[PDB]
Symmetry: C2
Subunit: 158 residues, 2 copies
């Protein structure tokens, strides 16, 4: 399946973050309130793996980082409207990622695309912190941001 | 120093290993598990994708997140069953499903059963189109990895 880049990959805190988009997909079960394959303009995927700093949190470097809460914000240049898109964790043929089928509500054009990545919720994940088996790192409190100021929505490339 | 609960099992698309060692301090402290000081040990369920595995879109050896893992402990000679809710967490050696555990029935031989449920309906999805798309589907009833002769003789540390 052809993947198209959103922009340059980012390294933010303990995460390596990439963004791609491609034709809308059919997901099972259909996640949250996302548009159907027919209603969507495309599928946007956030590829999140631990980088070297991720090692202090106990992640294997280069591995997928689960239990995160990822939200994308889309804002067309010259517009005050901002779309807020909740990403969901899911598997495609090339493994897990956070993604969503999305509509570019203000049409064709240039958009600021921002991914805000929050650490797992308090009751959803833990870290060993004892000396013997523990980690020296901790999760981030303020959400990490990977953003692209000039993404071009030029319509389906399929 | 890690000790096995028994031999690793392959159940459906999962490679499941069970180990135990000294109790640990976790942050946040998960559900109702005993503290490092209160506990007998820490038990870990290591769950990674096997060849079957690939059908769901995982890479062989990848940790499989979003599962709901519970362990049932039953001492040989007793009718009592103790239930242990595992929680997802990272240790210095990576992500695992684990729990600090106090053996309510004490020293002895136990049947140890891990029940592994697929992600909740609203917590994970699969791309199912021909194009992007995976052919396997998550299991309905929990997968089981069981050891019937686990010997708990007290701390080995
Ligand atoms: Cl924005
Ligand atoms: Cl929270
Ligand atoms: Cl900012
Ligand atoms: Cl049992
Ligand atoms: Zn996706
Ligand atoms: Zn653990």
């Amino acid at each position: 399946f052809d993947e198209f880049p959103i922009g340059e990959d980012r390294d933010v805190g303990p995460l390596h973050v990439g963004g791609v988009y491609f034709q809308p997909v059919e997901m099972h079960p259909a996640p949250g309130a996302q548009p159907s394959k027919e209603e969507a303009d495309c599928h946007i995927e956030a590829d999140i793996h631990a980088n070297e700093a991720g090692k202090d949190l106990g992640y294997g470097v280069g591995d997928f980082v689960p239990y995160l809460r990822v939200v994308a914000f889309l804002q067309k240049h010259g517009s005050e409207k901002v779309q807020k898109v909740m990403f969901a964790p899911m598997n495609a043929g090339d493994g897990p990622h956070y993604g969503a089928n999305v509509k570019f509500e203000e049409g064709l054009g240039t958009y600021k695309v921002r991914f805000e990545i929050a650490a797992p919720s308090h009751d959803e994940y833990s870290l060993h912190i004892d000396e013997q088996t523990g980690v020296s790192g901790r999760f981030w409190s303020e959400p990490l941001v990977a953003e692209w100021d000039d993404f071009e929505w030029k319509g389906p490339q399929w």
